[PDB]
Each structure stands twice: as C-alpha cells, then as structure tokens.
Write a protein that binds this DNA or RNA. Sequence first.
RNA 1: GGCGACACACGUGCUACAAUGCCCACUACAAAGCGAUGCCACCCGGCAACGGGGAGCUAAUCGCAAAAAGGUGGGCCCAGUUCGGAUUGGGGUCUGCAACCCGACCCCAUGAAGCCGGAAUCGCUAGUAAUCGCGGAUCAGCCAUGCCGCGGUGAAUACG
RNA 2: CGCGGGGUGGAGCAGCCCGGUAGCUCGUCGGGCUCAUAACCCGAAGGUCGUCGGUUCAAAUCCGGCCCCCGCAACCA
RNA 3: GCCCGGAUAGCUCAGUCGGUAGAGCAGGGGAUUGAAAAUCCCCGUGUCCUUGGUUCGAUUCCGAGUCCGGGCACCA
RNA 4: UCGCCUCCUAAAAGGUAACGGAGGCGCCCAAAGGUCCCCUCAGGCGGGACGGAAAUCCGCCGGAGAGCGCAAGGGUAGAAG
Lengths: 66, 25, 81, 118, 181
Amino acid sequence: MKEGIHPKLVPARIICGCGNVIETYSTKPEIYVEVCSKCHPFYTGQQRFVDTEGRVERFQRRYGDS
Amino acid sequence: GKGDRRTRRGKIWRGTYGKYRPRKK
Amino acid sequence: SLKKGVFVDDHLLEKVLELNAKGEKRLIKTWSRRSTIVPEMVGHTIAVYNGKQHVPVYITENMVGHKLGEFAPTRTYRGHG
Amino acid sequence: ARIAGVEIPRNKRVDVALTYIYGIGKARAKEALEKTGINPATRVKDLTEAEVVRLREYVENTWKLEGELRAEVAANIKRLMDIGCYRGLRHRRGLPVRGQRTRTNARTRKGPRKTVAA
Amino acid sequence: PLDVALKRKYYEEVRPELIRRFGYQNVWEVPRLEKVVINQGLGEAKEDARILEKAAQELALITGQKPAVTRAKKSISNFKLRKGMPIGLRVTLRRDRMWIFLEKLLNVALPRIRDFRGLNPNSFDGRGNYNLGLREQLIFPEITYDMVDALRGMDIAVVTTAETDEEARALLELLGFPFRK
RNA sequence: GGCGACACACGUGCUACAAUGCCCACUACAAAGCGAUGCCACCCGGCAACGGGGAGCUAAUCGCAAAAAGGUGGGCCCAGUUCGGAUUGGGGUCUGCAACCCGACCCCAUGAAGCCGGAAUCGCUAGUAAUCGCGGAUCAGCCAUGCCGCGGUGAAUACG
RNA sequence: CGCGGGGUGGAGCAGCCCGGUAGCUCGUCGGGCUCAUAACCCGAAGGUCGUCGGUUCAAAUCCGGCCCCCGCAACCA
RNA sequence: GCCCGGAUAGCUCAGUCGGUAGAGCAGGGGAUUGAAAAUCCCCGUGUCCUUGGUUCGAUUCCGAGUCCGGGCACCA
RNA sequence: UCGCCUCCUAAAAGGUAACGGAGGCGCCCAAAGGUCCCCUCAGGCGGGACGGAAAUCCGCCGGAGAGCGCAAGGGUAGAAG
Ligand SMILES: [Mg+2]
Ligand SMILES: [Mg+2]
Ligand SMILES: [Mg+2]
Ligand SMILES: [Mg+2]
Ligand SMILES: [Mg+2]
Ligand SMILES: [Mg+2]
Ligand SMILES: [Mg+2]
Ligand SMILES: [Mg+2]
Ligand SMILES: [Mg+2]
Ligand SMILES: [Mg+2]
Ligand SMILES: [Mg+2]
Ligand SMILES: [Mg+2]
Ligand SMILES: [Mg+2]
Ligand SMILES: [Mg+2]
Ligand SMILES: [Mg+2]
Ligand SMILES: [Mg+2]
Ligand SMILES: [Mg+2]
Ligand SMILES: [Mg+2]
Ligand SMILES: [Mg+2]
Ligand SMILES: [Mg+2]
Ligand SMILES: [Mg+2]
Ligand SMILES: [Mg+2]
Ligand SMILES: [Mg+2]
Ligand SMILES: [Mg+2]
Ligand SMILES: [Mg+2]
Ligand SMILES: [Mg+2]
Ligand SMILES: [Mg+2]
Ligand SMILES: [Mg+2]
Ligand SMILES: [Mg+2]
Ligand SMILES: [Mg+2]
Ligand SMILES: [Mg+2]
Ligand SMILES: [Mg+2]
Ligand SMILES: [Mg+2]
Ligand SMILES: [Mg+2]
Ligand SMILES: [Mg+2]
C-alpha cells in the first residue's frame, strides 16, 4: 500500500443486538450496528419468528365451526 | 376530516360510533 | 361475513355429501352460487350457473370459503375495441 | 435510529415517527409505546439507546412488517388471481374490486384517462 | 494487521473439514481464497466526477483501501459515453485486508440487507468462483447514512483457487456465507 | 342472471388540498319530527360494530338524544404533514332463505390523486350567502353525499 | 441514355449546407361558447423521413445502389 | 495585408464632456376581453466587442486584441 | 475528364493501354513527436446491483480476425498497438 491518502485501519470494536464482534480490525474503531441476522436472530440461527402460511390454512379452521 | 372514519369528526358525519367515537354522554 | 353461520344450500350439499360415501365422483349442475364451497366439495367437478349456462369448475384447497359464483363470472367483456 | 428493515425516522415525535414504518401507525404505534413503557411525547432524536433496542425488539418481533408484510399481501393476491376467482379477475384487469362502479370514475384504480373519439 | 478472526477460522476448521470432505493428496490442492475485487460501475457519475470523488472516498472507508478508477473502454451512443470518461471505481483487496473486509461482510453487512433470505446459490461462475452484488452502500458499519447523498451499490468478485463450484461452494459455506439453498 | 357492465364523454353532487387549520380531552346552548309488531334508558361482555340482560313509555309524562360548530385546555410546527382519506390486504359485527355478481358497518394494516383548478361558468340582496349539526318520508338492511324539513353561529355588497 | 431538383405526421411546406433534440399552416381528436351549425377559445394526439446497403460513437442529415417525381437537354443529320 | 467603420438583456439594439446603466415589440405577473389586438400598471446583469494598464472610480483613457461593413487597395 | 495516393486489369522481376473495374487526397497531431520503463487485442462462453446486443467488474478459452488519426494495400503484439 502506497503511503498517503488511505484509511488507517486500526483494531476496532463494534456492537449490535448481540454483544461485540471482537474481530474488529477496521477503519473508524468502535462502531454500532443496527442488528444482525448472524448473531442468530432474523434468518440465520433460524428463528422463523412472526411466521406466515395461515391464509390457505385459516378459512379451513374457523370456517365450518365458527 | 368528515371523511376520515378513524376520527371523531368522521364518524359523526357517517353517523356511526366506535373506538374513535365511543358512546358515553 | 356471518359466523354462527356457514351457509351452504342443502340441494347439492346433499349430492356432494352423497358422493363422499358412495365412493363415486361426478359432474353436478347447480343454480346455487349463494352457497359456500369445500372441504368435502374439493376434487369434485361442479357446473355453476352464470345466468346463461352451466360452467365447469374444478375444486381445490385454496378455493376454501369462496362462494360458488366467484368461479363463475356473469358478464362478458373481452376489452372495448 | 433504525427499526425493522431500515426505515430511520427522526426528530419530530416518536408515536408519530413510528408510522413511518410499513405496517405501523396510530393504533399499532400508540400500543408499543406503553408496552415497552416509553414516553410517547419524546422525540426519537433523543432517547436512551436502551429504549431503542427495547422498542425495536418489540415492534420488529410482535408483528410482521415492511419487507415480509408487503410480500405477503403480494402473496395473497397472487393466490386471488391464478386461483381463477372473480375477486382476482378484477386484479388481473387492474379494475376496482370491492363493489363500486366502472361506467364513471374508477380513476384511482383505473389510471389516468385515455380519451377516445365519439 | 495480521490476526483477523476469519483468517484464523479458515486454517483451524475450514481447511480440515475441506480435506476430510473432498480428500486431498496435496497440501496446496485444497481451496485457498484469493482476491475479493469490489467494483462500483457508476454511469451515475458520467459528466460529473464530483460524484466519483465521494464514492471512492466511501469505498476506501469500508475496505481500508481506495479504489482505482476504471475509464470508458469504447464510445457508445445510446447512453452518453465518450470513450474518455470514468465509468466506475474498482479496488482489488487481498491477503489480510480481504479477510478483515470479508469478515465484516459476513457478520454485519448482509444481516443489514433489507429482507435477505440468503445468497444466491447459482452465482458460482462454473469454474468455481462466485460473484454477487449489492444495491446500496449503507449496509456497511463504516457508513452513517448522514454521509450518503445518493445510493450506489456494487459488484463483488471472489476468486477461489478451487477448480470446481462444488468445491468452492463448500469453502465459502464453511467460512460462513449464508445461502438460499 | 341483468338493470351495478367500462376505451371514454357530460350534467348534479360530496370529501378535500390544511394553521381563521387538524387531532385528543373536558365544559356548554337548539328546533322540528319519530317510536309500546317500535323507540330502547341503565347493567354487564367485547378495542369497537354490537351482543347479552333487562326497566320506563299508547308517550309535553318514557326513548331515539350525543346537537355540531362554539368553549377550555393541551398536542401538531408548514411537512404531500397528526393535511387528505381514494385504494387495497387481513379480521369481524348486523339484517336477511340468502350479501360471488351487487349491501351497510367496525377494527388492524395500506395509505392515492390532490399544494385552489384552461376556455368557460353557477348560486345568493339578510337572518339571505357561507358554514354547522339534527329529524322524518321510503325502509328488512342499504349504496342517502339524494330529497323534504329543523334550528345553531352568521358576512359582504348594490355607484348606477 | 444525358445533366439539375426532389421524395418527411392526413394535405402543403421547413429542417438536410453545418451529424446528436424533427418544426409550421391546415386538417384530426377531447372540452368550451350557441337553441343549433359555422366562425371563435382551451387542450391534445399523430412522422422514422422512398428504399437497400455503407461510413461514424451517432445518419432525416455524409457516401453507394436501385425505385419513383419534376425539370432542362437531345444539335451539324 | 490597410484604413477605419458595425460591436450590450432574448431581439433591433438606442445612449462615450469618466463618477450610476437604459426604452419598444418581446417573456411573466394584474386590471381590461365573451372573440385578439390595441391601451394601462408592475419584473427582468444585459457584468455591455475583448484583456492588461491610468487617476476616486470607470458602458466611457491607452498597447495588443476579436468579430462584422461598404469602400479602398493589391494579387508571381 | 484533366494533378496526387491505394487496389485490381498487368500475362509470378520492373514497366505496361482504353470515355476499362473500384475507391481516396488538397488534411491532420505540441501530442497523434524523442527516449526509458512497463502493458497486450478483438471476439465467444460462464458470473455479477441499477447495466439493456451493448458502460464497468471476475473467470476460463482467444496468435491475431483488434489497434495502428482518414482510402486501400503492404505491414506489425518478439509492436508499428
Ligand atoms: Mg386525518
Ligand atoms: Mg351473522
Ligand atoms: Mg359500493
Ligand atoms: Mg453456477
Ligand atoms: Mg477458480
Ligand atoms: Mg340505474
Ligand atoms: Mg359495478
Ligand atoms: Mg353526491
Ligand atoms: Mg344512548
Ligand atoms: Mg364494556
Ligand atoms: Mg339489546
Ligand atoms: Mg340517530
Ligand atoms: Mg403529487
Ligand atoms: Mg377483506
Ligand atoms: Mg350482495
Ligand atoms: Mg354483489
Ligand atoms: Mg401545504
Ligand atoms: Mg373547482
Ligand atoms: Mg330578490
Ligand atoms: Mg340527516
Ligand atoms: Mg331505513
Ligand atoms: Mg333504520
Ligand atoms: Mg347513512
Ligand atoms: Mg372541436
Ligand atoms: Mg447507421
Ligand atoms: Mg448549328
Ligand atoms: Mg498536383
Ligand atoms: Mg491483393
Ligand atoms: Mg508485374
Ligand atoms: Mg510479367
Ligand atoms: Mg473479452
Ligand atoms: Mg457476459
Ligand atoms: Mg489488421
Ligand atoms: Mg488503413
Ligand atoms: Mg492493412
């Protein structure tokens, strides 16, 4: 890397809905991230929270008992 | 507005009652 | 909506429930579009009426609560020009 | 700061700035304010980043929202069409569904006028 | 800076699982990971290289490395384009700096992608490298959303020493690349 | 089944484009009409539509009934918005043998066009015009924003 | 055959020199005014440029062929 | 090559005893119109052909400069 | 039509005619010049947000079909690009 006009890239910290990613090693140390999927909410480390498919399911169940 | 049923003023127009125009005098 | 409810017409409601345990399945002409469809209807072949004629309709699971006259439309369009 | 999907509101109010998310507003909004126990009159500009990950988690978890919500509506209609049902033929032809009248103004559903001769 | 968790993670536990799976006579034959190349094609910036000076500024922030600037190969009419102008920024990162970036991309970026039900698993190029591309820049930690004027995504190239995709898919899987199966 | 069609075109309208304005809370002042096959107080369940229960009245004697604007207070801070609610997704209530075509209503989500409208063109001379709610006729329910009436607050301007 | 001009919305003309965005009058369609039509007013739609090649980054535009159209010429014999 | 003449908002472009920029059909806004057109009231860097230079100061002084006119000229 | 350049006619050296067949020039470039150092094309398939037959990016195959300021020819990547 030519010397000048370049980000420092110094060991970092970082955060989330989870704890730290202590890998770090970035520009601009100590960053705060919204939330991740990995850290396993939201897809990876599959929760399938909030989940769908009721619409074909529904008008079956309630329907002829009501 | 008189057309927004999700308001006080709207329901009054439509003549109806509900969560946005409950009946207690 | 209804709920304390579930209105189907006895006319075919019978003839479908019959074709349940007989073991046989056939093509049934109804004038009742007011009634609801499924689950013991599903897989059967019903001819609904549009006011003009009897129209074949295949039944399936996602046809669930839909009144029989949905799947048999009344007027004719084909664009303007 | 940013709640489900991305959708960053700010300044103004909080009960208000909640609407700016897809799936949320008025009712759903004024609800999550008491149920995370947060002051509705605050401005999302300032509040503890604690209440934020409280509020995010409730809203984002409680009910499905902007990405997955929109795509489910899409998915209902996909099924309302292609089932072959009437309510979905008025989807195919881009025409008004729930009752109403097409001899005169359908415009919102019909698009702008395309005039013709007499 | 030579430590970098994901690199570590490659040697202890990605390589071994990779030998034991495909089986390898030689120490080298097992897939190494070379050269993620980040490229922003920007016609967006065309007559304006003012735009460009911020974009390149922005990539350097995320990569720790500034891009070079690609220039217009030939002249093409139907959308503007004299053969002079800048079309885009492109940066080739390897060796550490690729890892330190790859790490954040796996742990942070893609999580913050709206929806994101996982990476396309058909984008291996058949000789066993994988390209993917992003629709916006603010899914990176280094970007604060108040430093964005306008949204420009990029193309990510990843070149594997793997001779097949079957092999290359494995390497990145075990590395932690989320796939749509 | 259709009269409810939909590339379009015209008349009559309603709701608006917002800060003399919007919303939420509380506090007030009308008239005319209707109803014991009906109006239904008050009690309870439900966010609510409404459902149970149930008292009074052939009705200046009980019920529809809350009048609304207004008022007082606080909230919004000029933003396609706490403007505006069309469209659509989902969930229900009621009438009715039955609400797919074609009912009205309630909740949740969605929130469109629209930032005072070309040429043109309508109404009104005072308790009128604007604006604000209320009743009946028909009627099972209802597409009533219509029609026939009721009072509330209340201008401007006529040289000629 | 010969030399010159042309071929573009429905009609009549621009634009082609000088490459990059096709204009004008009528006509047509929707609205207005009138009892009504006309006139008049407010809006709009509509050409790939005879054709096939070629040149350029790009062709109504520059070049080549052919197809029409008008025009001038065809004398000593 | 010469002599000089014509050099401005969007158009004719009008205005050089040095200190400041202007009108008419235009363009828009307003009355006026049932037709349009007169008439009437308001708003337009146009850094005035270009650059160094001279005094407070320069549409306005000097050297080059740039573009255009009849009129001269010349052309192995 | 008249001078200049390229290709054929031209009969494997040169040259060679016709109111024979076809096309170009009357410029251009202060870098499009000298030198030193590097670099290698078109195209095809596969991959990749906005990217489309085509903008840029990555992989493999690609000996010259690209480029060489403009006509053709000769030439040229072991460079003339
Ligand atoms: Mg509102
Ligand atoms: Mg019911
Ligand atoms: Mg309707
Ligand atoms: Mg593949
Ligand atoms: Mg490879
Ligand atoms: Mg009728
Ligand atoms: Mg209809
Ligand atoms: Mg109306
Ligand atoms: Mg009551
Ligand atoms: Mg209760
Ligand atoms: Mg009751
Ligand atoms: Mg009432
Ligand atoms: Mg708009
Ligand atoms: Mg629904
Ligand atoms: Mg119905
Ligand atoms: Mg119906
Ligand atoms: Mg406004
Ligand atoms: Mg109007
Ligand atoms: Mg009078
Ligand atoms: Mg009424
Ligand atoms: Mg009634
Ligand atoms: Mg009634
Ligand atoms: Mg009503
Ligand atoms: Mg006409
Ligand atoms: Mg061409
Ligand atoms: Mg003679
Ligand atoms: Mg010569
Ligand atoms: Mg040869
Ligand atoms: Mg020879
Ligand atoms: Mg010879
Ligand atoms: Mg290639
Ligand atoms: Mg490709
Ligand atoms: Mg060559
Ligand atoms: Mg050549
Ligand atoms: Mg050659």
